[PDB]
Amino acid sequence: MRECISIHVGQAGVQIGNACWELYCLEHGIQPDGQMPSDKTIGGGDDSFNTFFSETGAGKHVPRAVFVDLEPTVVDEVRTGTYRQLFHPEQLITGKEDAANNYARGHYTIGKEIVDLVLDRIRKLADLCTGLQGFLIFHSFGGGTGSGFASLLMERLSVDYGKKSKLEFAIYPAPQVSTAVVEPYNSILTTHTTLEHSDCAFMVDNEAIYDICRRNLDIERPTYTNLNRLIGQIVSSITASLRFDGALNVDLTEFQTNLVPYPRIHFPLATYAPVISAEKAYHEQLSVAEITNACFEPANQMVKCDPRHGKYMACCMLYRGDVVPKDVNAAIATIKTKRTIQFVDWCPTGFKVGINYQPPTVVPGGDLAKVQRAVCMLSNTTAIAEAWARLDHKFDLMYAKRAFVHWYVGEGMEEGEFSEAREDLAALEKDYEEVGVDS
Amino acid sequence: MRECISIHVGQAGVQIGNACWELYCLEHGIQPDGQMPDSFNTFFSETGAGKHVPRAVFVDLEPTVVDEVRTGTYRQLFHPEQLITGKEDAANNYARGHYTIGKEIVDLVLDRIRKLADLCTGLQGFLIFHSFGGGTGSGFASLLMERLSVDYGKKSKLEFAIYPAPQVSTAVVEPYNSILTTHTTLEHSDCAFMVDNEAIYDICRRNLDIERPTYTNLNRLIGQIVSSITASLRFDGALNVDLTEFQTNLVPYPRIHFPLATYAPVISAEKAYHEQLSVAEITNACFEPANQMVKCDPRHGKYMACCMLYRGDVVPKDVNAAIATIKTKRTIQFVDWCPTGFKVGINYQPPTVVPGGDLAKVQRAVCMLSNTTAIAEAWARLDHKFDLMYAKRAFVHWYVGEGMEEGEFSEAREDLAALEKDYEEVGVDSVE
Amino acid sequence: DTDSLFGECRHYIIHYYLMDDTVEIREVHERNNGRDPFPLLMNRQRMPKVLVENAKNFPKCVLEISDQEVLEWYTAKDFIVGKPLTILGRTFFIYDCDPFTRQFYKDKFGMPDLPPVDVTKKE
Amino acid sequence: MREIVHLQAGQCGNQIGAKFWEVISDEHGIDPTGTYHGDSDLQLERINVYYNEATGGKYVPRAVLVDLEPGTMDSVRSGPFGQIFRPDNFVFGQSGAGNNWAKGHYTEGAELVDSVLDVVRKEAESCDCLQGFQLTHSLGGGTGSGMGTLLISKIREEYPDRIMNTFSVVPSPKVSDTVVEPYNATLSVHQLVENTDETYCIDNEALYDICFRTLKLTTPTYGDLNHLVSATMSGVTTCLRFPGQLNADLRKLAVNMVPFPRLHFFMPGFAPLTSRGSQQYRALTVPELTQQMFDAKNMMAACDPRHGRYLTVAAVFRGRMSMKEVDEQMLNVQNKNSSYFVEWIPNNVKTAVCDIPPRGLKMSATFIGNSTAIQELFKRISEQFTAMFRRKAFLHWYTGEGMDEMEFTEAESNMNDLVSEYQQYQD
Amino acid sequence: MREIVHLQAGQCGNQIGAKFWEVISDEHGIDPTGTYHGDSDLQLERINVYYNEATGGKYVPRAVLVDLEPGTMDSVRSGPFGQIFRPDNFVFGQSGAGNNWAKGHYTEGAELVDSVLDVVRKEAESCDCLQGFQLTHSLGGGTGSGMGTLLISKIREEYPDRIMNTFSVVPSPKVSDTVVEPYNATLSVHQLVENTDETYCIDNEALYDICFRTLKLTTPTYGDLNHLVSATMSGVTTCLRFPGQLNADLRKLAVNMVPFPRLHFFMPGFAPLTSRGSQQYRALTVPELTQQMFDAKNMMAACDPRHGRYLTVAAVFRGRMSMKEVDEQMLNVQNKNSSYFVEWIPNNVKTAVCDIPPRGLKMSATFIGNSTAIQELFKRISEQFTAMFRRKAFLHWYTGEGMDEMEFTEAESNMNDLVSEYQQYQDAT
Amino acid sequence: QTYDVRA
Numbered sequence A: 001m002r003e004c005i006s007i008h009v010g011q012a013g014v015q016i017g018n019a020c021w022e023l024y025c026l027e028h029g030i031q032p033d034g035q036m037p038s039d040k041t042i043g044g045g046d047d048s049f050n051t052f053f054s055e056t057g058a059g060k061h062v063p064r065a066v067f068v069d070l071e072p073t074v075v076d077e078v079r080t081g082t083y084r085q086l087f088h089p090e091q092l093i094t095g096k097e098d099a100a101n102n103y104a105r106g107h108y109t110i111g112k113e114i115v116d117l118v119l120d121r122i123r124k125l126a127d128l129c130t131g132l133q134g135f136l137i138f139h140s141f142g143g144g145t146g147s148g149f150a151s152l153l154m155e156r157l158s159v160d161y162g163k164k165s166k167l168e169f170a171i172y173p174a175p176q177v178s179t180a181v182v183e184p185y186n187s188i189l190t191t192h193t194t195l196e197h198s199d200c201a202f203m204v205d206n207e208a209i210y211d212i213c214r215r216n217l218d219i220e221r222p223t224y225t226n227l228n229r230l231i232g233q234i235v236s237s238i239t240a241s242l243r244f245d246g247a248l249n250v251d252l253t254e255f256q257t258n259l260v261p262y263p264r265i266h267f268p269l270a271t272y273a274p275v276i277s278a279e280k281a282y283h284e285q286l287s288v289a290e291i292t293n294a295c296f297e298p299a300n301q302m303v304k305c306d307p308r309h310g311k312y313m314a315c316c317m318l319y320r321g322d323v324v325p326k327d328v329n330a331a332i333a334t335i336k337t338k339r340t341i342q343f344v345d346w347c348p349t350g351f352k353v354g355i356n357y358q359p360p361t362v363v364p365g366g367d368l369a370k371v372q373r374a375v376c377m378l379s380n381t382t383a384i385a386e387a388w389a390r391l392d393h394k395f396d397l398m399y400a401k402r403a404f405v406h407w408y409v410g411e412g413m414e415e416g417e418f419s420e421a422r423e424d425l426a427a428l429e430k431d432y433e434e435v436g437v438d439s
Numbered sequence B: 001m002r003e004c005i006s007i008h009v010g011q012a013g014v015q016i017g018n019a020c021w022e023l024y025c026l027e028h029g030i031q032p033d034g035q036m037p038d039s040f041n042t043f044f045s046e047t048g049a050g051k052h053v054p055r056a057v058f059v060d061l062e063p064t065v066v067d068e069v070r071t072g073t074y075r076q077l078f079h080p081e082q083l084i085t086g087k088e089d090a091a092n093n094y095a096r097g098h099y100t101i102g103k104e105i106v107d108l109v110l111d112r113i114r115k116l117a118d119l120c121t122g123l124q125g126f127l128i129f130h131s132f133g134g135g136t137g138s139g140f141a142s143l144l145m146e147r148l149s150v151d152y153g154k155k156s157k158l159e160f161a162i163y164p165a166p167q168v169s170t171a172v173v174e175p176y177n178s179i180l181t182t183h184t185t186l187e188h189s190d191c192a193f194m195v196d197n198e199a200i201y202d203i204c205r206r207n208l209d210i211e212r213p214t215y216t217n218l219n220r221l222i223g224q225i226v227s228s229i230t231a232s233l234r235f236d237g238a239l240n241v242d243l244t245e246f247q248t249n250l251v252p253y254p255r256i257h258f259p260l261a262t263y264a265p266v267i268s269a270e271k272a273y274h275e276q277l278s279v280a281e282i283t284n285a286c287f288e289p290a291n292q293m294v295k296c297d298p299r300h301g302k303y304m305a306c307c308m309l310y311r312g313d314v315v316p317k318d319v320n321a322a323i324a325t326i327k328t329k330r331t332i333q334f335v336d337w338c339p340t341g342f343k344v345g346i347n348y349q350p351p352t353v354v355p356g357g358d359l360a361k362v363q364r365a366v367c368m369l370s371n372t373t374a375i376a377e378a379w380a381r382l383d384h385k386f387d388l389m390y391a392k393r394a395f396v397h398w399y400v401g402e403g404m405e406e407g408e409f410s411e412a413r414e415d416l417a418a419l420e421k422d423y424e425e426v427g428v429d430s431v432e
Numbered sequence C: 001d002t003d004s005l006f007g008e009c010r011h012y013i014i015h016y017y018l019m020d021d022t023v024e025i026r027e028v029h030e031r032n033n034g035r036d037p038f039p040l041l042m043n044r045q046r047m048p049k050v051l052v053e054n055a056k057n058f059p060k061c062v063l064e065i066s067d068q069e070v071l072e073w074y075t076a077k078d079f080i081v082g083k084p085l086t087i088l089g090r091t092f093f094i095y096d097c098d099p100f101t102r103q104f105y106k107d108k109f110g111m112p113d114l115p116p117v118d119v120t121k122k123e
Numbered sequence D: 001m002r003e004i005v006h007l008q009a010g011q012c013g014n015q016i017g018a019k020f021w022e023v024i025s026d027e028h029g030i031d032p033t034g035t036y037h038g039d040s041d042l043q044l045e046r047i048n049v050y051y052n053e054a055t056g057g058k059y060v061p062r063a064v065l066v067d068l069e070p071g072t073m074d075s076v077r078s079g080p081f082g083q084i085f086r087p088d089n090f091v092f093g094q095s096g097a098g099n100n101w102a103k104g105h106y107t108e109g110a111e112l113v114d115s116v117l118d119v120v121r122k123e124a125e126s127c128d129c130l131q132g133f134q135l136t137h138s139l140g141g142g143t144g145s146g147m148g149t150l151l152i153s154k155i156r157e158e159y160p161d162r163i164m165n166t167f168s169v170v171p172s173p174k175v176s177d178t179v180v181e182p183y184n185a186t187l188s189v190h191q192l193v194e195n196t197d198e199t200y201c202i203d204n205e206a207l208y209d210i211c212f213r214t215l216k217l218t219t220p221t222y223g224d225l226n227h228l229v230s231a232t233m234s235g236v237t238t239c240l241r242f243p244g245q246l247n248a249d250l251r252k253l254a255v256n257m258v259p260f261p262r263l264h265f266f267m268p269g270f271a272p273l274t275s276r277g278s279q280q281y282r283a284l285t286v287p288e289l290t291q292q293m294f295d296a297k298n299m300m301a302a303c304d305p306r307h308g309r310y311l312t313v314a315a316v317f318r319g320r321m322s323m324k325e326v327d328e329q330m331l332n333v334q335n336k337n338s339s340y341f342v343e344w345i346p347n348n349v350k351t352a353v354c355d356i357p358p359r360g361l362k363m364s365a366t367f368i369g370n371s372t373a374i375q376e377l378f379k380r381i382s383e384q385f386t387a388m389f390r391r392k393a394f395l396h397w398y399t400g401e402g403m404d405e406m407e408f409t410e411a412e413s414n415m416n417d418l419v420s421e422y423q424q425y426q427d
Numbered sequence E: 001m002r003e004i005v006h007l008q009a010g011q012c013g014n015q016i017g018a019k020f021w022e023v024i025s026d027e028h029g030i031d032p033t034g035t036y037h038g039d040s041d042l043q044l045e046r047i048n049v050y051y052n053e054a055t056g057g058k059y060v061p062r063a064v065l066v067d068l069e070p071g072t073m074d075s076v077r078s079g080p081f082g083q084i085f086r087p088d089n090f091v092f093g094q095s096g097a098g099n100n101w102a103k104g105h106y107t108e109g110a111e112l113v114d115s116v117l118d119v120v121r122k123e124a125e126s127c128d129c130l131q132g133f134q135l136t137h138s139l140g141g142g143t144g145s146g147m148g149t150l151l152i153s154k155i156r157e158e159y160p161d162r163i164m165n166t167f168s169v170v171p172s173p174k175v176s177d178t179v180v181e182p183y184n185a186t187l188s189v190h191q192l193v194e195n196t197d198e199t200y201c202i203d204n205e206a207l208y209d210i211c212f213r214t215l216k217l218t219t220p221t222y223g224d225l226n227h228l229v230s231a232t233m234s235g236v237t238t239c240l241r242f243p244g245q246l247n248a249d250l251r252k253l254a255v256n257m258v259p260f261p262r263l264h265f266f267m268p269g270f271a272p273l274t275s276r277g278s279q280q281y282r283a284l285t286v287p288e289l290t291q292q293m294f295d296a297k298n299m300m301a302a303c304d305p306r307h308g309r310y311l312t313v314a315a316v317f318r319g320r321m322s323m324k325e326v327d328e329q330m331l332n333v334q335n336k337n338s339s340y341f342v343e344w345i346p347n348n349v350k351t352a353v354c355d356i357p358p359r360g361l362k363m364s365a366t367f368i369g370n371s372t373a374i375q376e377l378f379k380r381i382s383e384q385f386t387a388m389f390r391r392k393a394f395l396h397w398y399t400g401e402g403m404d405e406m407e408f409t410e411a412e413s414n415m416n417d418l419v420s421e422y423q424q425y426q427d428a429t
Numbered sequence F: 001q002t003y004d005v006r007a
């Protein structure tokens, strides 16, 4: 049976794991005790406590997750949270000293201490499952733990499981705003693993959600938890066709196949709709026609880029709820007859549609209203090229003065790798420019 | 019916007797006075009064360590003459317990084992618990075993003993006692169960999360292991194995009788609540080097004969699947002349749990008796400690003063050098 | 301090200055005394007893307790013989006082009767 | 876990550290006796960073009290939280230094460093994983400016990887109380630049100026200057002791604060500073914290960053708040004061959030910044040091200790090499 | 069973033994009258080791108090636990030795040894299985340094197999009160090496240094030093009297502590000593014990082992503790200070556990150690002995007894032999 | 009301 394991790394991965696993528990109706002898019966998915949760004879469905961090406090709150009895304490692994926003520390000195323990944990998780579909890994490019310790982990995971897919949900640094100053070195240096030891990337910057939450959900003073709930909605929508039945069920393999035209181009963009508050939601009527039009709005993109400046190459569709095929069909035919939407010459047919039954559940105390239908978009496009260009511009002005270098070389990493990784993004930017040329 | 007699010697023998008989009484249901509120007949003899009379012999050269048992909760479990004490101790000295103080008490302790064996009709064998460091556990056990071999030539004689630890040590003259004891456990032994405290210290902190363990915490685990090997005799099972079978299916050559034990699962009551026991899952844990109770790496040697012991809700289908999993890895090595190296025994009743213990109430269990050549490196580290000792001739005057000839010190050093030399002889591959 | 494992019976002498009302507590060191010779437990200062009920909105991490925030100061009224008195969670039972203190209290403060109370066990 | 050992040298160090131990005693809810009576569980989960457990439910500070004169130890033991410190942690000599750097560094420093290293090593081995040592001292003293520079040199050799933060007190020109003040400061700063990972320059006259205008205290004693310093000292490790939405520690900024090893001097600041009268009229919030941070009036030292150039900026936010507004203020202050930030480092601002508010307050904030204006303080000392060094004045006190003259020259050389490298980063 | 007879020689021995007999009287809960009043069962389970049963529920110490001067007998009879001792066990002469070694061993020693012998053989025959005898004395006296050496000379001939432990007082070079001190000491260490199973070198100067700094008592009376040695004395046989998780006795340690018969001089340590202000800030944990046993300040000998090499180490722990924590620290200390241990002896440490703590305390530990630093004390005697023996000063007191001059030469030769071979065994490969 | 005089 299909199954996925979560590899959440660092503070960002753990906090996302708190939101996502809370959604998964509520999606299937699991108590924070990890049990369900409860009287009320929600759903009928006997097969569905698989995949995410692991059924046991005693009735507790222990989740298939791995929480790892090099500082204990971020996991310690999970150890004393509401779902403490839900999680396997050994699935929670802590470190005594963190990378301290240093890619080097988490890659050569501090990471290697717990690598053997972490990879051993993954093995027995993979031993429990029969058919593993792929790995879902969450981290951030800003912190050293999410950038350094994750990078070696995928390097050792790739040589251990050559065939199993590895998906990348990561926090990209925002173009204008930042929570660190040595951040560009770590993001420059973590691009190498996610280029050669990755299958699909899901970069998202924190600023775009602040734009989305303020403009649509009307939350004027948002928080991280508001960001995490939106992220959890995306991943459930990705896994929705796996968990429940549907007319057009899609697993992880097909939308990987129908998104990667060349091995070096695996950086799509995520888009979710509809995203509106409780008050405004019921006053409009909501159909398939307008929610896919919101999916093409530049202001609704999760990454600060204009797709009109770029050109679509492969768009993966994910419908869910009380959707009907024609209004999916008629939506697509309306999409094609717009000059503002541009497509590459070598992909006349650029859509992949999946259809599911279960409407998206709403966690109490959220911002999304309870709605009947939803839609998830995974659009590979060349408009993400400008994001790397700004990061190179930020890096170039600070490598020239050799700022912050002594922390890295003093840790034990060579300075020649710094110039090497910059050349890679110089190369990778030209690769997207090659596709943007039309014959 | 099959019977077994307990010949516990030394301070190690008496505490391991307390832990093992406590588990044994709870296993059958024995009240501390000795009353059932007959599978128990193998270890218990009945009177008119229904007292079950454990078939054990507690012997030590110091009275304090057995008087604690005499005032203990089980003061009315054990027979007052079965408790035999000595006025003065061997004092970590092999010669003192072998030629001066031991010989005074040999006559009585041989009369006790005679009467206990006179109670038994068909005796499977004896279990002996002793030490290699202490004088009484090494010296007195040697001569008792020396006189036990002649007294009963055929009867099986199992040796459960502690080995001196590779790094830590509770004394300074243990290698002299340890080196001199290998002669007895070679020409007068059928099976050996050397286990050091560090590895039991190692396993407790990582699995049971006991950061500050004590000897009772280890002694409960060894009480579990001795329960597992015999549980096939005590209760029924699909594939019942006795003492003779696993003795035959572990010893290819007479001088090679030092198996390495392994037990699983060793988990806390909390751990069982969020983890799913399975036959294949507990089988794998018996092979990890981090769980061995001997500080040696079997991946540095090769497995030569492995004895399997399943206990609990065990199904033969998952037994074969686990073993089929076992044979298909390169990391696990086997000797060339043994393609088939397993001996499977299946028992019904799961191991019980004593209140105040550490092991969770588990549904399935597994015991491993893996004899390999990687144990030979343990003796090598003993010689290097011994050779740096014998060169400067320290502590020899104590041994000489008792009346032991100094030529035996070189002779014992040469014997296990030959015993080491037998082991890489097996490690040679028969490349045709 | 008998309740804690570090039980002690050290006697103390408490000085109140009429310069400005200030209290200091010196210790009585013994022959062996088990302790490093130290001058005093506390130094000349002003003890509050209760402060203004607006203490909830006072940033005590930045500004110190001051004469705006206190509404009452420690005075000689808690400092009366025969009755215990707490400073900083210390029981501090008054055993006795000096004859000059007895005079001043009787003829200038007003209370005439402050008899001594023995505090020593019978061995 | 993550422990901290607090070094305490000199009367300046002793009074500041004793006040500091009070302002985290009230936070972790420990009495002057040594018992816990707090309410929240988070108040007692990470107490091991600063306190060490004893029998009877008593928690002792991990502090080493050093001062070459026994008089200061009398006041510290006689303080409110006086009987909280261990007597063996008190180490003290019999003769002072007379405000002379050379005596306290070589002559009377030699007999006492072995005792200081003894207890420091004991406190080092007591903890399992150690993050670094914290030292509070004055750069114009005789012991902290003297022996204290000897202490830091020895620990760096012993423990190289561990972080060194120094809450040193640097003199002021307008108000000074010692004539041989420049000699000790100029001979101490050479020790900080070679062996210190980051330094917090604090000046008493800036504290006096703040109390004269910002806090509106009529008779400023030494305590309020110390309490305000102890607030900043608590404001840096509050993210370490408590959970937060965007967690941080002493290395996360320290990694993010050192572009080059020669530049580790910082401007500490504290945002919620209001007069008692205007406390009701002021409405503390994320904006009102921000504009109070970035003015030079709130700054705790004696250099105007307006004349200088901001290299890197830290904002450690204590309490519960919304970061999009926190983000917006940092981006806004970056955009409008563009001429005041560097052009070769974009996104100069580092931010961190710890949810626990300080005691007696709802919101608080700590600012640590590296700007070009720190060179103005150093060149000010050179204007007075050389003017007192051109006539060999007050040299026989220093020369009588057995020291040469090139030590004065090499100290002035490296500082003039420091500021020249510091000035070239401005331009 | 396993009994001990407590010999008691000299004013040093009488005051030390009186304090010791009071100390284990408190532990075993016996009043000054002589009846048992203790609260626990095990306080009277192995009391036959030290005490003898008397009709009417009375326990008499198995002690033999000897001194050539009758003045000290009245003081020990006027002490707190003075009446507990049997009056017949008091043996004493009429004239002292005057700090002269030759008088106490040759001239005035001959008349009274038989009276000592009659009571000593009486107590020895009383116990069925005696583990050995036990003597406290001073090397700087005329009785203990004299008569005592004659006593240990005879008792080896009669009872060779019994364990001989000697808790002798060694002189200090810095503090001294006898002009003819080194002559007696040089003539006593020769008797110790031939006829003694183990010796514990105690020094008053180190005990003062402990009480000046560690306990920081301003006025150390002679009880405080006698209390310190009594605690170490009880810490040696506490594992014998009470049960433990890892049992031991005198023979268990002695086999592990003597590599060569010439080497039986040990160097004791007692952990739990802290000042009253140090109680306030202290966590009662075994690493705090282990650090405090192994520092050079705590030891009550006049030798710093950092210039020596630790031959064998013994540590008997009194209390109910975890031996994984116990065993790790001894492995830890063996690894960090590798240079101070012999390389030909791996696992230099012997450990034992006794569950019952000392009275009024939760945790304690007793340390016995053999190191090269004990040779630093014997040569320092020769620096003064030869300086006095070259000019033949103060010789007519020794010569007037009728003895020759060769005895000093052989005693100096034997100790020179011992310190020379001891250095060889320190740097042996 | 009753806490004695205590030593």
Ligand SMILES: Nc1nc2c(ncn2[C@@H]2O[C@H](COP(=O)(O)OP(=O)(O)OP(=O)(O)O)[C@@H](O)[C@H]2O)c(=O)[nH]1
Pocket: A009, A010, A011, A012, A013, A015, A016, A069, A070, A071, A098, A099, A100, A101, A102, A140, A142, A143, A144, A145, A146, A147, A171, A179, A180, A206, A224, A227, A228, D245, D246, D247
């Ligand atoms: N969107 C979002 N981003 C987060 C969250 N938590 C942390 N981050 C990002 O993570 C970056 C810093 O890394 P952290 O996750 O805090 O720490 P880390 O991954 O453990 O790496 P180290 O700091 O070296 O230990 C910040 O810049 C944030 O943008 C979160 O809950 N939501």
Ligand SMILES: Nc1nc2c(ncn2[C@@H]2O[C@H](COP(=O)(O)OP(=O)(O)OP(=O)(O)O)[C@@H](O)[C@H]2O)c(=O)[nH]1
Pocket: B009, B010, B011, B012, B013, B015, B016, B060, B061, B062, B089, B090, B091, B092, B093, B131, B133, B134, B135, B136, B137, B138, B162, B170, B171, B197, B215, B218, B219, E246, E247, E252
């Ligand atoms: N695992 C384990 N080892 C023990 C136990 N009891 C004693 N030992 C070991 O035995 C060694 C010493 O021998 P003991 O059994 O204690 O004493 P002994 O064998 O009677 O020898 P003597 O003391 O000379 O009489 C010690 O080093 C311990 O490691 C026990 O209960 N469990």
Ligand SMILES: Nc1nc2c(ncn2[C@@H]2O[C@H](COP(=O)(O)OP(=O)(O)O)[C@@H](O)[C@H]2O)c(=O)[nH]1
Pocket: D009, D010, D011, D012, D015, D016, D067, D068, D097, D099, D138, D140, D141, D142, D143, D144, D145, D169, D177, D204, D207, D222, D223, D225, D226
């Ligand atoms: N701000 C502040 N400064 C202090 C305090 N105590 C002392 N100082 C300063 O420290 C200087 C004297 O330092 P000193 O005692 O000689 O240092 P030491 O020689 O190391 O003991 C004076 O100029 C004071 O300005 C204090 O509590 N607060």
Ligand SMILES: Nc1nc2c(ncn2[C@@H]2O[C@H](COP(=O)(O)OP(=O)(O)O)[C@@H](O)[C@H]2O)c(=O)[nH]1
Pocket: E009, E010, E011, E012, E015, E016, E067, E097, E099, E138, E140, E141, E142, E143, E144, E145, E169, E177, E204, E222, E223, E225, E226
């Ligand atoms: N530590 C300690 N030393 C003592 C005690 N009593 C006497 N001494 C020492 O014993 C020495 C005198 O011994 P002495 O009476 O001549 O011994 P005797 O001739 O054998 O009786 C002095 O140097 C004292 O230091 C005591 O109670 N404790």
Ligand SMILES: [Mg+2]
Pocket: A010, A011, A071, A098, A143, A144, A145
């Ligand atoms: Mg982090």
Ligand SMILES: [Mg+2]
Pocket: B010, B011, B062, B089, B091, B134, B135, B136, E247
């Ligand atoms: Mg024994």
